[PDB]
């Protein structure tokens, strides 16, 4: 067992001094001056904040691309998360077109066995048939999946057009599953890529021009209004633009359950990174959606503060210099992705809490509790309460860290915040009740993490079901 | 020649006392106590307002449907328009899928030859190919077309998907033509129609349910953001919902050239009309987009007052009871459309000007001048100035009329404003300088109207071109 003594417990709504006892993977006792069971390790939390461990609902460990694969695998990635205070992830099973969803799922489960910390899967709907629909039923009922991902970009690859979006959202409703969407208009992205390439604009500086913010705003509007029409909730991954944020606020202002996820990169970086004179440096920032002009950063902070953005994630998707250079003559061939799992909570604490933009309670809500609630993992995760999973982070408000590809634990040779010094760091990270990160020493072990099942029918479907009862149409008697 | 003496001239910006002399189709002189040329007819305008004749940019005279055609033809519709103060129309050439646009154009010119007042055509892009693109250029260069219509609804028929919208809008930009769009999400409409019919809801009350307002809002957002991305203007026909209007205002707030058209029906009727216990009465209201819950009418009036809705039209598309009854067992087979060309200006004067919602100058802008400017017909039309076309209406602010299918001149057995009494009516209508409507006497003659060519490149393209140069992508030198 493990007892954290002397800390201030900080949740998504309150702070209070208390000790916390963990055993058998769970929180067993909370209170002042708890007794110590015999042979129990004791961590001295004086002067620090004890918080739920971060949940990163957006990762892509060892995701295949071309004949190559993300340079971070499920062990190195989950270990790097632990070093940064993140104690569990939700990754993505991405079937090839016409490939069995269950086949892809078992493959990814094999890849994920080596994880060092708890993990789960979204499953992407990259094509449609009666069989896909039946397979999502089996994934929900027998494999712990409760959320399905849709890509509106990637024409002539995994794009979900309207008819797939409609059939699949309808299926999610039947199953009590949460539809999630990468919102970018695939036709416009494809058209702009071709236009820019024909102009000889082949460098990384053309990447953001190929998918400007209104391309994301349009896709968000469309996914949102499909969800409204079919009567499902909707989770929009990595919101980067004022345009898309505004569509979310509009829908939430109509009563509709729409959630938005944001990455630290899109809160803190602007699109000038793509004009760096060194090709490799500019290519290190290539991801979709791309980093944006500054006015969007301000708008996103506003969403977080006003409750129209709800979770943070990383889109952790690592490619080293030689992989990025596959697009040296064609930016559309640059493997898209940036690293962030190790860095998310310190970036957010330092930019959000130290500034006074966010309270520490909002910080917890935005790094674990909201994600737990949305995907039906609360209070098993994101909660400091007796019986909850013992996933915790001890936080030193006066510690500092300089982010650097030379020192980080992420298996990648680039950091989009290279040289940034933050104040406020995870001094200790506890997963399943075990101390896996301590004072610069990572103790992660391959195979330690568990596959985490998520039950269907989160609370929102009760509300939605009563709405549909009252909107049931009624014929006119004539 | 025709001299209108003693009236108050009312334009889109000012009012003043003056006589107006017409000859050889044109306004020849404006001023007080104008000399009377010998043989000149004189019209006493004392106590009345003289404004530009209405322009209705959205009519469907004798539109073919299944085995039948709209019950109004090009003569009877333009004659009814004249009785209502409207002196010219823009109709639609609608080629069948895979049919030559030029072939359809010539057929429609043959049909419209019988018009009693000036007329022109938008051309609908109902399918796509290189030849479609070639023909658009020939239509602009040789046949006086400068606007192309796109239907986002009507799946499995004439829907333009994103790839056609992109390709066609790009062609519009190369040609200096205005893209126009019927904005409803056709996949959602199709889905809801099938789901309602499978629940046995076959009556007209199911029609509004099959295309709720967010379906128009989504499509508007998508067309707006394609136009933004391709750098074209955009004209949205018959806006009916707060959602779509909000998308227009959002784009206009960012400086984008987006125009919205509205029908009197959507300003003054609500969706309760579809629950009328008489089937034929409810079916008389069935058009797309449908009439809306009452919050939407208020929003549209504010759109008119704020400059975010720009033109009025009727979507004049007449079907008699026996034709409407084609969908007695299946609302989706009711021919869609209502009549309004005769009624538009009185309805808007009586509801807008009498109430203080609209100035008299806004009334002129909304019934002629804005349409003329948008489609590059100003100041030929929509203007009271020497050398402009002598298309005029003399308006009696104290005259009254009761709208009725029993007394209107539209060749249709239904009026969606049956029994409504309006104050402020056109006492006289002048077209090409001839008195064609005078105190209840309709003098319209088949073939009197002229085909009206609209030159390409309205002024908005000049500013768009400077914008595009200023926003040029610039390669990074490395
Ligand atoms: Zn994505
Ligand atoms: Zn992703
Ligand atoms: Zn229409
Ligand atoms: Zn129409």
Swiss-Prot record, chains A, B:
Catalytic activity: 5,6-dihydrouracil + H2O = 3-(carbamoylamino)propanoate + H(+)
EC number: 3.5.2.2
EC top class named in words: hydrolase
Cofactor notes: Binds 2 Zn(2+) ions per subunit.
GO molecular function: dihydropyrimidinase activity; hydrolase activity, acting on carbon-nitrogen (but not peptide) bonds, in cyclic amides; metal ion binding
Residues where substrate binds: 154, 288, 336
Positions contributing to Zn(2+) 1 binding: 58, 60, 149, 315
GO CC field: cytosol
Superkingdom classification of source: Bacteria
List of residues binding Zn(2+) 2: 149, 182, 238
Modified residues (N6-carboxylysine): 149
Alphabetized UniProt keyword annotations: Hydrolase, Metal-binding, Zinc
UniProt entry tagged with the keyword Zinc: yes
PTM entry text: Carboxylation allows a single lysine to coordinate two zinc ions.
Cofactor(s) the record lists: Zn(2+)
InterPro entries: Amidohydro-rel, Hydantoinase/dihydroPyrase, Metal-dep_hydrolase_composite, Metal_Hydrolase, Metallo-dep_Hydrolases_sf
Family recorded in the similarity comment: Belongs to the metallo-dependent hydrolases superfamily. Hydantoinase/dihydropyrimidinase family.
Self-association and partners: Homotetramer.
Annotated function: Catalyzes the hydrolysis of dihydropyrimidines and of the structurally related DL-5-mono-substituted hydantoins, to produce N-carbamoyl-D-amino acids.
Descriptive protein name: D-hydantoinase/dihydropyrimidinase
